Structure formats: structure tokens, C-alpha cells
Symmetry: D2
């Protein structure tokens, strides 16, 4: 019929387009030809639409889908309208339980491939041949807020990877900091209850700036290392593409001869590390609560695929007690300076889902999903987790057959004698459903352990001790690893940590709790302690001033791997720039600007006060992407204002604030020709200053200064200036 | 490995074998080549076994499936045994809720095919061409007991057929008597509560012989017609193959010009009608509680497929008020003498399931599952049912996506904008999930009503009246249709009704309730009333003796279609005979007997006091199928005792009782040669009597007398003799 | 109204009567004065009936409980009959999942009391003073058949006791033979699958006389001790009152000084041990499938209380 | 039935009538009320038909619907007055 516009404009191009150039689509429709083995096997449950009749779930076609069956057109609805009651019953039952933690979350499809065979250290088939690529499904998440919460909150992010391997599913479920808050799994409910919304009134959402959180931190000094990380810029990332990932426990790699190696897993972001600053990150949860979900979907549609390196920290079994921290302690990190991360392979995320609920909401990830070649250790938080993620699926996913939900199915064979349970999909033809059996000659059969394709056998570690509910004395140290983290931070990074604690703590209503947290900080480092204390109006006791600092970590004084900005690495590719238009824009400026950006892989948004299009001075028509208020500075990386009829936007409060917000959030600002009038707005010396690129015309060098600032992410040197600005 | 016996004997032959000749199997394995469109489409979810490794549900192969992971072989089990916890979690969650009524039940696969096109009366595609065969799935059931209850109880049986048609699923959900107990659906919970186990102690199971049942009958005279049917031999069938089926409501057939015809649906058993007698039926729930489940599975494996004729009672819309009973009353039957059953097509059940839970327990049948060409009427019990069977699936089958459970899926297309809900299997690629929409150009689209492949549109019946909770005065008559049923019964059929009421009523503890039920019977017929009263020690009041009998039904005095035995029809095929062996059986007798039976299609069981085999007098080896106590007379149709060394079994209490039980249950007994010694056991005149075939040798005429008695099912003439027998 | 017979005969006497002399009743109504601490605390959720109006679950009284709301007395039922839809929705959802094993089962209320203090061997408060009586709830069960199966089948019976003690619930969950069939819990699903109805056709019910059962026994010689017990008359008891009970595992008793003692628990039937014979037991599942449920209910109503040591 | 797990949501404490409710509905998930009524069906003589139906009246009577007149055909159609 019509309803569709002919000119075809309702459908997106099935090819990479920049951010916001087209409506977004289902994966299959946007990228018909990105295939892999898991993607192809879901084909049996994909449903199309075009040229199909509207039906009931029982196949009966519907003639009127606008009206209920009533006795006369102004009369009562009849109980025999089965078409209406089916349509409203399925609506009434749409929602399943959300994840009790990590409910927010965004996922994509892609693959893993090893750099070389690691057969010398593990008999794990997915790592056995550099030529073997493995389908993955990855979901990035926050920790506290419900699925309806905002993306750019201050929190730990999760990073879960499902590996569809030839010998089983290996789920590597980690987060973006290398230590957790708790040593023992028995305390997990108390910690999650304390971070979560408070019981009486369910406030706050997506925030730890509340009394109970900080109450439990002050009473539990083991939480302090990971609270330091959450309080850093590490707690507000720019993108899921711009963060590290970590498995946090020590695991084992078992090779074909039986040798066990301890390992810790890392994910290194090939786009560099980068974070937002808090005023930006907080305002942006109001301006776009879906910023992280949006930008991942769109990087993949523009072809700016996310890529990460899998990296191992290997430690021989003999060195188990070589460090002055316990390797099985989850609140201790292993400094890369002591043990290096060896890069093992690479992961590429290159396809979005077709249906968020079906693929993303129904995905089950559990750390107990290991394969031959891997094994667990006695880490007390890892041992408890193992109980949990099988259990939780019985209500979230309705039952013991969650592995039959299509995103979760092994792409390799699985046969065993488990029968029945809710929405059992497999019809078992085996005459036996028990072993040992003679009637189907004992099939399916047990397999002995071996080098390739053998059964799972656990590593025969020796256990001796009594049945005790008791914490190991080796776990008893709470302060050298937070001070190592603190000392490895650049100065503006440390500022930002002071300010993180000061904001959060200002929101605790009960002052004794805030004092209790400053006492703990004085055991880490007094400078840190004094700074936070000051913002809160608290004085340190001369005894607090005489607390002796913790020891070094194996004589290490700092490790720069723990900082985000100290050793620089920066994608300019896939970043986004806002260009502020006016009604007679100088095309000379504009075609130079856009060419430069295109060569580097950077996306532009042409922004105005009205939608529709303006016309450059040469009569070129430029379509406007958003208004100044519609796409705030908050959502880009740099602002460029070309020359032209400047008088048009000069008096506009929105165009001027666009620049003041951006200035304050430490972003590069480039002013060509008369656009330099706005220096007077953000208060700049005619003599100039760093981070403001200015010139008579937009050209090659002007763009070079801009892209160079952009590779450096923010102009940190401006931090003294930005305090006098009211924005 | 071994475990299997080589000689191959653990596997059944993939070809028709008689009852008990082989172990039974999954459908696919026993009948690899009975296919149909629904059977072939389930292929995507069938799972095999052979040559496959035992794995977890996540694909990881298991090396030791006999032991848990413990710290030392006499130590504690470790929480990190993920293999053990997955195996016990799925076990812990095997069971779904059972059907709140009809929980017992047995199902099979097969097809329907029309005799001719019925396009003149209905635009329903499954009935449009005699060349169009339709996949069906059928489940026979009882009504009261749970799924663990016995098969041969006295109760109404259900008969539900799922038609996988090209234009949707049509479920015809009926039972085996033509009227129901209740007029209005609002009372269904009170009636089912009264039949069901009593609330305080949950007794009895599978029985209505308890106070609350008979309390509600005495207070509710509309239940009396269908209680008469349940009290007849109609309430204890011999097989699901030997019963009629009925849709009970008046429905509408709508043709392509818009003309509506009222219709009532029938299923006529091509094997004849036959029932057990109560002592037999009751003892058999102890001796084999699965008798009806067993014998259906085995008729289909022997190739004695069940077949039924679909038959219509059509009434023109103009004759809506031609009878003296309301057509929309579900407690009134339409006499076949007034309106004939026209035979429309035939159904054949020819394949068993592979997995009972998967296929049978997860099947959802609902009467609101109609197709174009059919419609509903205002019957008050049909209107309420319509609410119910969508509702109940939300807990039984866990949610709004039960149609995705493989047995329940349309074999034809279904597309619509329903999204999400628990264990959502379809991944929808449609960019829209609402209509009207322009972005997927309004697909899937609504279809106008038409002659073939059009949308569902309801018949535009006129409604005028006020909103009233009130019963129509036309429903107010409770007694002529039970007396029509009573008068159409043979004399021994009526005996059996007297005895049904007398047994049940003897089990009511409260005597006023029994008196109240006899008063009601005296309004139906005084002979009936007096007979029951007598067995109970009750006297009828002279006023009870002067109740005027109900009127005829449109001047009909009896209809013989309502009797089981009056016009005879009888399958001897697929019936079963027991042959009582001894250690020197005369082969002359035996090869004559078995040849005769084989020519008629009748199955034999060679029975002895010991298992293993005996040797005929000519050295033939005969394998024994059961012992006399192992397969009682209860489970066969006739007993033949050949000649040979009779002295061997003559003194055996079991062999003698085998004959006395069979005698009493009115079965044919055939005695060859010296076997006639046993006449002295069952007390027969040397002169002979009917139903005891006797001769010098088993031969042609001896077998002819036997198969002739067998086509007549029981020897009714013996009923006066059997009272003196203690068995 | 009437419906009740006056002469009063619809109600049972609230006093001990013999088997079948009266209709059976709810506990409260038959024995208003057998109380204990658990029985009294359930008082907050008991609901009565007499002299009360019939209502919806939301408290709205019903005037016509015989008819649906239709547009004219021969017309269609209206979607706005909320009284009808509530009544049929709760009906539609009556059933919860049954026990995956031991689904059959019959229960009663009563108490436990120690002969003397066992403080020398255990610091368990319910066993500390002969004067301390403890509320129990007990459920006897079979193992194989569903809740609709028959009572006098050949099988192991379960015997589960809930002790409502001052320091927590102690559940002693045992059966009526002193050993189990399997050594390791990892095999429990394979053994229960083999005893249970077979997968293709779900036969038999309440019986081990089928191939898969005996297949797994012949391949697993550890099952043989307990199969001997099930094959004895021990597998067909006369009553739940006429059987022994056993916890089957070795447990520990820990006293106040920290000393641990191994223990195995027994229940000794003060009515003696007695079993049916198989032809009797088998025919009786046809003649009365509720024989064991019935006779326990009625021993307690006649005052022939079950007692065990 | 899915949000609150079943047909007994009215027994969840915030949702309970503060006035009496008695009827013959039994069972369903997390059934809190233990019904002592010997009957769970009406009509019944064994608990003398309690709890009983109440006629409609001015105060404390049963629910009865307003007897509006309905005439028309079974139609899935929007009234022109809504146009
Ligand atoms: C090193 C510490 C931990 C890390 C790195 C971690 C990581 C994660 C991640 C990334 C998810 C999100 C799953 C998804 O995206 O679908 C998750 C879910 C969850 N975690 Fe943790 N977790 C940790 C500790 C714990 C502990 C101690 C428990 C339990 C005792 C726990 C229980 C769960 C449960 C129940 C879920 C929801 C499970 C599910 O939906 O499948 N976690 N965790
Ligand atoms: C003419 C009267 C009736 C007939 C012939 C009939 C027949 C049947 C049959 C054959 C089944 C078994 C389904 C199966 O095998 O899976 C069934 C199930 C059921 N019936 Fe009826 N029924 C009648 C009246 C009622 C009424 C009045 C209600 C409800 C108001 C009702 C509610 C149900 C429900 C809830 C089930 C279980 C539904 C399911 O499992 O899908 N029935 N009925
Ligand atoms: C010495 C061996 C065993 C004994 C004496 C025993 C006894 C029992 C009894 C008496 C019940 C009935 C509960 C009731 O009446 O409500 C029961 C239920 C059950 N048993 Fe066992 N059992 C044994 C071994 C096992 C094993 C090895 C498992 C599991 C690995 C198991 C799993 C269960 C489960 C899941 C139920 C149903 C639980 C419930 O409904 O709460 N049993 N058992």
C-alpha cells in the first residue's frame, strides 16, 4: 500500500554509513553478508515479514486488526473474540525478571582468533591453531542500576564473552577493573544490598553516593582498593571501546601433559583508553541515557568495529608464594611490571543483533562454563560465583532448558540423559535415559581425558586442612595496593579521584560516616586524605597525621599501566566532531575541514538552530543533523566553527553555551576567520592559548593542530582556567 | 562396548509385530517410514544418541559420570563440581503443572482425509478437496484422576484432535458422550470440585462414588442426563478404539456466500463399540493401570491403526426452533432418528510419539482454535470454555509462547507483531512491531474475507436483549432425554445401569444424599427408581410412585443409536485371545488354532505357570509369553485351552481361576479334547451351553464357533448363571 | 436454607468414632481440642464459612453464582463479567509441579517427647529435657508413582518428620529400609530414570517390573542389597503404622564440649511390623487405591494414634 | 499471573481486603488460606450451603449488573460517532 514513502527513504542502505546518516536497522538487514557459524545457525529461528499476512500465533489470518468484536458498533465486547484475547494475553506477559546485578547492558556479535598455537601451555582447542576462528557474543554492562537505568553513570562496567568453541561454550565473564570489592562470596549479598537503591524508598538509582554504600565501605577496608578505581575517571568511560577488561581471578591453564600454569586474563582496547569527566558524564545521563548503547550500535554500523587483544599474565606453579600479596586474593592486582601481559589473540565485534530481547536479554553467561585446558583455583569469591549463575536462570529464564534458548545453544553437539523440564525443545529418540544401559548399548558414552577431544577431568590439587569458615591471614592487608594505584596516577588523574570522593561523600547525610571514610584514606596516603577532608570541612587529628604509610608492593613504587593517560594511545578514528553552521557558510573552510576529517576516519555532525538545510556561499546545500540544543557538546569530541555569516549565530545563547560547556569539559575548539569573535565568550587572550586552534581560514595546518589535540583526548592544561567559567 | 547382547536382541524389529512379541520403541525407530508433514517438520528438534559422546548441556564431554568431585575419595564434595550440579539441577526441575482436568491421557499421530468437497456448506480449506490429507495429533484422556491415575476407571473419556490445516490449527476438543453435565460455564469449577478428590483428605482417586459428587447431582437435576451415560457401560470402554466421540456444542459452518448452517460433530469408531463390565474394569485398574495406554501403543505397532469417521448432524438455520429441546442446550442430544449423521471423511492413527513428555504432555488443545468456514454459537458452556484454554497455558506451559513448543507449532506460516515473553524462540527481523506502520510498509498485512485464503470475519448474528445473568427458560427441562436414553437400552444394558448407580450410591456415607438421588430417578422412570432403591434398602413413597413420566422427545420413544449393543458392529481384528499351555501340548490343536486366528487378525498369548518354553508333543518349542497370574483373563478377550497333558495344569488353582474369572466376565471359552475336564470347574451341563465351545479336537468349526462368539463381544445370555459363581 | 438435613446428619460428631461410622472431616472440626504450638500458630490463616457471604477475592458479594452475564438470556457472554473471569482464572491455575520423587504421600500432625536429657552426647535443645515436647508434621510417601498413583504398590516408602524446635527446624527425612540403592549422589538421576515410567510411552506406573529398572540393577551390583528389601514383604506394608523408619546416613551428634559421636537414626513402630502379601496388595490397588491414605486418616479419627520410638 | 506469580495475588499483604472475603476457590501457587469448609462447591448440603449468595439491596447486597439494552449484530466495527 503506501504508508511507505516512494523514493524508498524508509529503508537504510545495507552498507556502512556514518553515525546518524540513516535510520539504524536489525543486523541482518543492515549487514546481510557478515556471517559466522553462530550467526548462520540462528537462521533457523529468524522470522521475516514482507509479503506476509498478519496472523494469529495459530496461523489464522486476521481481516480486522483495528476493532474488537462487539454486539453492535456502540455495544459491549464479547468474550468470544479470541483474536483480541490472544493479542492482549501475549502483551500482558512480555516481561521476564531482569538480571539481579548487571541488568543494564549492550551486546554485539563477532569473532576471536589466536596469534599462534598455545599448545605448550593449554590443551584448550579454541587456542590451539592461529587458523581457527571462534564465534563470540559479548555483552557490556554496568553493575547497580536496573535495565531502564542510564549508561554514563559512575560505576564498574561488566565485560562478558561467550566463546562458541568446538569442545563446548567457554564464558569469560569479567569486568573493567582488575580487582573486585569483596574477598569472600558469602558477603556478596551484603555488598550488593549496600550499593543498591535503599530498601525503604528505592533511591538512588545508578549511584553509590548514599549512606549505606559508604557505611559498608568504612566498615569493610577490603573494599577500598576497588572503590579507588570506581572513584577515578576509570568509573566513567567514553565508550565500551575505550576500556580494558579483566577476569579478576587466578585460573589454571592445563596442558596435554598435565602441567598446570596460573593465569590472569586481560582485554586490551585497540582504540586506546579514554574517559569522560564527571560533570560531563552526569549531565549526559540526562541529555542521552542511551549514549553508550547508541554509540556501540553505530560504531559497528559505520564499520568502526571494536577490537581487543586477549592477554595472559602467566605465573608458574612454583612461584605461587613469590609475591607479597596472595595470588588467590581477588582484591589484589598483579603489577604488569612484575608480571607482563603476553598478547595471545584478537577479538572483533562486527555485527549487531536483530532483536534485543531475544538475543541480548535472554543471554545467560556463567564463569563455570569452562572447557578442557582450563580449570579453577580456590579463590573464595570464584568458588561462590560458581554456585550462583546456574541457580539464577531457573527464575530469570524460566527453567533448566535455558541452553535451548537460541542465543545460548552450543554450535557443537551436546547429548546426555537429561529429560523434561519447562519448554523442552528437544525430542529425544534414545530408548534409554540413564546410564549404564544395555538397551541403546550405552550411548551416548563417557570419553577418557586426552590431548584433543577428551573428557573433562579436574586438576588433582592437594587439599589438607579442617572444615573451617575462616579467612586466610594472607588476605589481611588492605592498603598497599590502593596506594600503588594512587601513586601511579598523573596529577590531574589524582585531582579527579579527590573530587570523586568529595562529591560522593557530600551526599552522605550522616557525617560520622564521612569521617569514618576519611580515616581509612589517611591509612593509604595523607595527601589524598587531606584533600578530601578539606572539601568536606573535616580536620585530621594529629594522630591521623602520624599514620605510617603501607609498604610497597614487591618494592614497586608506581606502575604506569594503572593510569589511563600516562603512556598515551588514542584512536582518533571513530571519534565525532560538531561543526557549527550559519546561513552563509564559507565552503572553502567547510570542504577543507571535511576532507581532513574523512582522511583520519573522524565523523562530523553539521549542527544549526533549525532543522532542514542551509546553503553555503557557493549555493551548496547542507542538510542539518541536529540543533545545538538537540545534540549538545556532551555528545561530541571537539567543536569546529567555520567562517561565514557569523552574525547569525553570534547572538544565539545556545551556540555560545555550546562553546562554554565544551571548553569546560576540556575539549579542543577550532575557530576559523570571523568565528574567532567567540574567543570573547570563553574569555581567551588575543595572544591565544593551548587547545584553541584559530586561524584566518580552515586549512591543512589548522586541521593538523586540531587532529593532534584530538589524538591527545582532552586539553588537561586548561584545568586551572575552567574554575572561573560559569557553565 | 558390550552391555548390548550380541545376537542383537536389545533392539525391536522396525516392522509391525504382534502385542508383546518385541520391546516397544519410539515411533521413529519402530516406523522409520511413516511420515507426514507435521511428523517431518518435527525433524529439526529430534535428537539421536548412537556414536555420540555424553556431554553437558553446554557441549563439554564428560569423562567420569559415576562420581562426584571430592577432596580425597572418602572426603567432602566440592561446590566446584559444575558437572554434578548441572545434572542434579535439571533433575530437580523436570515436572510442569498437570492438566487441571483430563491430566491422565494417551496420544498418537495420523491423518484426516475428506470423502468429497464440502464447499457448498463450509469454506473451510481442510474440507474442500477429497485429495487433501491433513496431519492430526490426537490425545484420549479421562476426566477426574491425576496423570498417575489408572486407565480403566468409570468416567467420561476426552477425545481431542489437532488439525494442522493450511489456514491455521483447528482443534476439535470433544468427549465420548454427546451431552455435558452443566449448562453454564460459571458452574464448571463447582462441578469439577465435587467430582474431584475431597478437600480435606484428597480421597478418592478416579472415582465419583463419594458424597460430594452425589450431593451436587441431587441438588442439580441438569447433571442427570450425563450421569446416566457415565453409569452405563459407556463409562468403562474396552479401548479408545471402541468408542464414539462427540463435540457436544452446536457450532456453525459458514460457506463462501455467507450462509451459516448449525452442525454437531461425531466420530464413529470403525472397530465397533465395546465396553468392559465393572468387576472386570475395576480389578483391571489394580492388575494393569496402564491397560488403555498400552493397548493403543501396541495396536499401532501391530499396524491395527485406529480409524474413525468424521460425521456431521446439519440443521438449517430456519429449523432453529423446530425441536422441543433448545439446540444451544449442551445437556440435550439431537436424536439421530430426527437428524442423521452424514459421514464426511476418515481419520487414521498410525504413529506413536518418540517422547511422551515432549509431544504428549506439552500439547495444548483449545476449542477457540477455529479456522475460516467455522464459527461459534451462544451455547453458554461453549462461550465460557473459550476464556479458559488460553488462560491455563500461562502456568501449565510457562507462558504466552506455548505455540512455539514444537508439537503445537502451525505447519503453515504465522507472522504478527507480538514480541517477547518467556522462552521466546523467534528472532524477529521486522523493523516494525506495531501496525499501522510506514517503515516496513505495513507488513505483515491484514487480509479481507474471501472464499479461499481470506481473513477471519465473525458471522453477523443479531443480538438483542439486556445485560442479564439469567438462564433461558428453554433450558428448564431435566428428564425426557435421560428417559429416552434409558428406553433405548437393551435389557442387560439397563441392568448394568441399575448396578452402576447402586454401587456408587452404596459408597455415600450420608443416607439422605442417597434418598435424594432416588427421588430424582423416580422422575425419570419408576422401574429404574425401584431397582436402585431395592439394592439400597429404600422404600418409595406412594407419592414417588405417582410421579408422572416426562414427555417424549419429538414423539420419539427410543433411538437404538444410543445403545452400545442393540445394532451390532464388531472388530474381531486386533482382539487378543489367551491360550493355556501345558507341557505336552497337542500341536494338531495348536497349529489349527493359530492359523484360524491369524486369518481373522486376532492376537494370541501362549500362557503357562513358568516362563521360558515348553515343547509340543512333536518336539516343537513354544516360548511362553506370560504366566497365568502375570497376564490375567482380564487382559484378553477369550480363552482357548488345547488338549495335551491336561493333568499338568488341572490341579493348578491359577489355571482354574483363569477360567472362572473369564466365565463370570461373559467371555467365550473354548475347550478341546481333555480340556473339557474343566467344565466341572465352571459348572457346566454335559449337554453343553452357549458361549462354551467344546470339541474332541481344535479344528475349523470349533474355531468358527469361537470367532463368531467373539464378533458378538460378550455372551450376554450367561448373566443369570454368573451369580452363583465365586470368582 | 435447607440443603442440610435436619436431624443434623450431614455433620460428623466431634469425638472419636470407629472407621466408617461417620463422614470424615477437617482436623479442626473433628478435633477442636487437640492443640499444639504449631497447630495454634496456623490459626492466623485458617478460614471459616458459616454465616458468611459468598464473595470475590476482593470482598464484593455475589448475588448470582449460577449464571454468566450475557446480552439476553440466550445471547453471548460479555467480556465485562469480572465475577466469571475471576472464578475461572483461579480454577485455571490450581496445580503446582508435583514432587519429582515421592509425589504420592499422606501427612499428619503430632509431637515428640524425649525419655531423658541427652546432653552428654548432643547439645541439641529438642533432646535436652524429657519435659520439652516438640510439634512435628510427618508425611509418609512411596517413591515412583505420581500423586495420583495407588497406595499399596510394591516400593520403598518415605518417612519425613519436621521438628519445630526452639532453635530451628530439624527435618529428619528417611525411608523404611536401612540402606539406599546408590552410593554416590551423581547417579541419582540415572537410577530414578530407570525405575520411573519409560520415556517413550510412560508405562509403568508405580512398578519396577520393567526392563530398564532391571537393566540398571544387573549392571550395577551396589543396588542389590536394597532391591532384596523391596522384593521382600517389606515392600508392601499393611499400614504406615506397621513399618520401621530409618535416616540411612551416618550423621554426627556434637555435645557442648565439642565431642562428636557418629549416629544412625531409627523409628520403631509401637504397633508391630506387618505386611500384606502380593496378590492381596496388587488387587487392592484396583479395589481401593487410597487404602493407606484412608486408614491413616481414620486411625487418627478413631483415636488409634500412630506411635514410634 | 506472571508478574505476581499466580491466582493468589490478593493474599499478598498490601492487596488484601480489610473486609471479609469467603468463596470456594481453592489451591494455586503460595496459597496462604487454610480452608476449613467441608465443601468447596455450591450448591451443597454438607456445610448447609455456606458461604451463601446475597440478593441485591440498598446496603450490604450482592453485585448485580445494570440491565442495559443491547441490540445489534456481532461486528468488529468502529461507531461513526467516534470519527
Ligand atoms: C570478580 C567478581 C565478579 C565479576 C568480574 C562478575 C561479573 C559479572 C558480569 C560481567 C555479569 C553480567 C552478565 C551479563 O552480562 O549477562 C555478572 C552477572 C551476575 N553475577 Fe557476577 N561477577 C562477580 C562476582 C559475583 C559474585 C560473588 C556472585 C555471586 C555469588 C555473582 C553473581 C552474579 C549473578 C547471579 C549474575 C547475574 C547472572 C546472570 O544473569 O546470568 N557475581 N557478573
Ligand atoms: C462440552 C464440554 C467440554 C468438553 C467436551 C471438554 C473437553 C475437554 C478435553 C477433551 C480436554 C483435554 C485436553 C487434552 O487432552 O490435552 C479438556 C481440557 C480442559 N478443559 Fe474442557 N471440556 C468441556 C468443558 C469445559 C469447561 C466449561 C471449561 C472451562 C470453563 C473447561 C476447561 C478446560 C481446561 C482449562 C482444560 C485443560 C486445558 C488444557 O490443558 O489445555 N472445559 N476439556
Ligand atoms: C538415603 C537416601 C534418600 C532418602 C532416605 C530420601 C528420602 C526422601 C523422602 C522421604 C522424600 C519425600 C519428601 C516429602 O515427603 O515431601 C524425598 C524427596 C526428595 N529427594 Fe530424596 N532421599 C534420598 C536420596 C536422594 C538423593 C540422592 C537426592 C538428590 C540428589 C534426592 C532428592 C530428593 C528431592 C529433590 C526430593 C523432592 C524434594 C522435595 O520435594 O522437597 N533424594 N527424599
Amino acid at each position: 500500500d503506501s504508508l511507505a514513502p516512494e523514493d524508498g527513504s524508509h529503508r537504510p542502505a545495507a552498507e556502512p554509513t556514518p553515525p546518524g546518516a540513516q535510520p539504524t536497522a536489525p543486523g541482518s538487514l543492515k549487514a546481510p553478508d557478515t556471517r559466522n557459524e553462530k550467526l548462520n545457525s540462528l537462521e533457523d529461528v529468524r522470522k521475516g515479514s514482507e509479503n506476509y499476512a498478519l496472523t494469529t500465533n495459530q496461523g489464522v489470518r486476521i481481516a480486522d486488526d483495528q476493532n474488537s468484536l462487539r454486539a453492535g458498533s456502540r455495544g459491549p465486547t464479547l468474550l468470544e473474540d479470541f483474536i483480541l484475547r490472544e493479542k492482549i494475553t501475549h502483551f500482558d506477559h512480555e516481561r521476564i525478571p531482569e538480571r539481579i546485578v548487571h541488568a543494564r547492558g549492550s551486546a554485539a556479535h563477532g569473532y576471536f582468533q589466536p596469534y599462534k598455537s598455545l599448545s605448550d601451555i593449554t590443551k584448550a582447542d579454541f587456542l590451539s591453531d592461529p587458523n581457527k576462528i571462534t564465534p563470540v557474543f559479548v555483552r557490556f554492562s554496568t553493575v547497580q542500576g536496573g535495565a531502564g537505568s542510564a549508561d554514563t553513570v559512575r560505576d564498574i562496567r561488566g565485560f562478558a564473552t561467550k566463546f562458541y568453541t568446538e569442545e563446548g561454550i567457554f564464558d569469560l565473564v569479567g569486568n573493567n577493573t582488575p580487582i573486585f570489592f569483596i574477598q569472600d562470596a558469602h558477603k556478596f549479598p551484603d555488598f550488593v544490598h549496600a550499593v543498591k537503591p535503599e530498601p525503604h524508598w528505592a533511591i538512588p538509582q545508578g549511584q553509590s553516593a548514599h549512606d549505606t554504600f559508604w557505611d559498608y565501605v568504612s566498615l569493610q577496608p577490603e573494599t577500598l582498593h576497588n572503590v579507588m578505581w570506581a572513584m577515578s575517571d576509570r568509573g566513567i568511560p567514553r565508550s565500551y571501546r575505550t576500556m580494558e577488561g579483566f577476569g579478576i581471578h587466578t585460573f589454571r591453564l592445563i596442558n596435554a601433559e598435565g602441567k598446570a600454569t596460573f593465569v590472569r586474563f586481560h582485554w586490551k582496547p585497540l582504540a586506546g583508553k579514554a574517559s569522560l569527566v564527571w560533570d560531563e558524564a552526569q549531565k549526559l545521563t540526562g541529555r542521552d541515557p542511551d549514549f553508550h548503547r547508541r554509540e556501540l550500535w553505530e560504531a559497528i554500523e559505520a564499520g568502526d568495529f571494536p577490537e581487543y587483544e586477549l592477554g595472559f599474565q602467566l605465573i608458574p606453579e612454583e612461584d605461587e608464594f613469590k609475591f607479597d600479596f596472595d595470588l588467590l586474593d581477588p582484591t589484589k592486582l598483579i603489577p604488569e611490571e612484575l608480571v607482563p601481559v603476553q598478547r595471545v589473540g584478537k577479538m572483533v565485534l562486527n555485527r549487531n543483533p536483530d532483536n534485543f530481547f531475544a538475543e541480548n536479554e535472554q543471554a545467560a553467561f556463567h564463569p563455570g562454563h569452562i572447557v578442557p585446558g582450563l580449570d579453577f583455583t580456590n579463590d573464595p569469591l570464584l568458588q561462590g560465583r560458581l554456585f550462583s549463575y546456574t541457580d539464577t536462570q531457573i527464575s530469570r529464564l524460566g527453567g533448566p532448558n535455558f541452553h535451548e534458548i537460541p542465543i545460548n545453544r552450543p554450535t557443537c553437539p551436546y547429548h546426555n540423559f537429561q529429560r523434561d523440564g519447562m519448554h523442552r525443545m528437544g525430542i529425544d529418540t534414545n530408548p534409554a535415559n540413564y546410564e549404564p544401559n544395555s538397551i541403546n548399548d550405552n550411548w551416548p558414552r563417557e570419553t577418557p581425558p586426552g590431548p584433543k577431544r577428551g573428557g573433562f577431568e579436574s586438576y588433582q590439587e592437594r587439599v589438607e586442612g579442617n572444615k573451617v569458615r575462616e579467612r586466610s591471614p594472607s588476605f589481611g592487608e588492605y592498603y598497599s595496593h590502593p596506594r600503588l594505584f594512587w601513586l601511579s596516577q598523573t596529577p590531574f588523574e589524582q585531582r579527579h579521584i579527590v573530587d570523586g570522593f568529595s562529591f560522593e561523600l557530600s551526599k552522605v547525610v550522616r557525617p560520622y560516616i564521612r569521617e569514618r571514610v576519611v580515616d581509612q584514606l589517611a591509612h593509604i596516603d595523607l595527601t589524598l586524605a587531606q584533600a578530601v577532608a578539606k572539601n568536606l570541612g573535616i580536620e585530621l587529628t594529629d594522630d591521623q597525621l602520624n599514620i605510617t604509610p603501607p609498604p610497597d608492593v614487591n618494592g614497586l613504587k608506581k606502575d604506569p599501566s594503572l593510569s589511563l593517560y600516562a603512556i598515551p594511545d588514542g584512536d582518533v578514528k571513530g571519534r565525532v566532531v560538531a561543526i557549527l553552521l550559519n546561513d552563509e557558510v564559507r565552503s572553502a573552510d567547510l570542504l577543507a575541514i571535511l576532507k581532513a576529517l574523512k582522511a583520519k576516519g573522524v565523523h562530523a555532525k553539521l549542527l544549526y538552530s533549525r532543522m532542514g538545510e542551509v546553503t553555503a556561499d557557493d549555493g551548496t546545500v547542507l542538510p542539518i543533523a541536529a540543533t545545538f540544543a538537540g545534540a549538545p557538546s556532551l555528545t561530541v569530541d571537539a567543536v569546529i566553527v567555520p567562517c561565514g555569516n557569523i552574525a547569525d549565530i553570534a547572538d544565539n545563547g545556545d551556540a555560545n553555551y555550546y562553546l562554554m560547556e565544551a571548553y569546560k569539559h576540556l575539549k579542543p575548539i577550532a575557530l576559523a576567520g570571523d568565528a574567532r569573535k567567540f574567543k570573547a565568550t570563553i574569555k581567551i587572550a588575543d595572544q591565544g592559548e593551548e587547545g584553541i586552534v584559530e586561524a584566518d581560514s580552515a586549512d591543512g595546518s589548522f586541521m593538523d593542530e586540531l587532529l593532534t589535540l584530538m589524538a591527545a583526548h582532552r586539553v588537561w592544561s586548561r584545568i586551572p582556567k575552567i574554575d572561573k567559567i560559569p557553565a
